Amino acid sequence: AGSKLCEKTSKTYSGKCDNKKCDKKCIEWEKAQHGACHKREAGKESCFCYFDCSKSPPGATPAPPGAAPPPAAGGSPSPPADGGSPPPPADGGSPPVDGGSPPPPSTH
């Protein structure tokens, strides 16, 4: 009938290599359970995700490439970015005069 684990190797991830993006994209594209990213081989970033398929027995026994997954690793980059900082109020010049000017936006 069916009962095992299915893992994807960025077979449809595309785009840059991120942390949450790799996982989200995995569950959004491959509807997996958990995904991760790793840079290696000519600097090529690969995304590996694992999700229960068919039934997923208590033994797991996924479908790896060669039965040799990556180490525990410890990367997952995600610096402090994007914290609420929209563009200025579109006044309208025509011709354009740059616009903006001080004071500066929020978040020092």
UniProtKB/Swiss-Prot annotation:
MF (Gene Ontology): molecular function activator activity
Keyword Disulfide bond on entry? yes
Q: Where does the record place the region Defensin-like domain?
A: 4-53
Primary localization class, coarse: secreted
Q: Which parts of this chain are annotated as the region Disordered?
A: 57-108
Q: Which stretches does the entry tag as region Epitope recognized by IgE antibodies of mugwort pollen-sensitized patients?
A: 40-46, 55-63
The set of disulfide-linked cysteines is 6-53, 17-37, 22-47, 26-49
Q: Where is the composition biased (Low complexity)?
A: 91-100
Q: Which GO terms of type biological process are on file?
A: defense response
Q: Which domain of life is it from?
A: Eukaryota
> What effect on the protein does mutating residue 26 to S have, as reported in its record?
Loss of IgE reactivity
Per the record, its GO cellular-component terms are: extracellular region
Q: How is it modified after translation?
A: The mature protein extracted from the plant exhibits an average rate of 76% of hydroxyprolines. O-glycosylated. O-linkage of 3 galactoses plus 9-16 or 21-23 arabinose residues attached on one or two hydroxyprolines.
Keywords from the named record: Allergen, Disulfide bond, Glycoprotein, Secreted, Signal
Renumbered to this chain, the Pro residues biased-composition regions fall at: 59-90
Where does it live in the cell?
Secreted
- Biotech utility: Post-translational modifications do not seem to influence T-cell recognition. Thus, recombinant non-glycosylated Art v 1 could be a starting template for engineering hypoallergenic vaccines for weed-pollen therapy. Optimization of codon usage is required for effective genetic immunization against Art v 1 and should be considered in the development of vaccines for the treatment of allergy.
The record's comment on protein family reads:
In the N-terminal section; belongs to the DEFL family.
What's the entry's take on its domains?
Contains several extensin-like repeats in the C-terminal section.
The protein's name? Major pollen allergen Art v 1
Could you tell me which species this protein originates from? Answer: Artemisia vulgaris
The shown range, given as first to last of full length, is 25 to 132 of 132
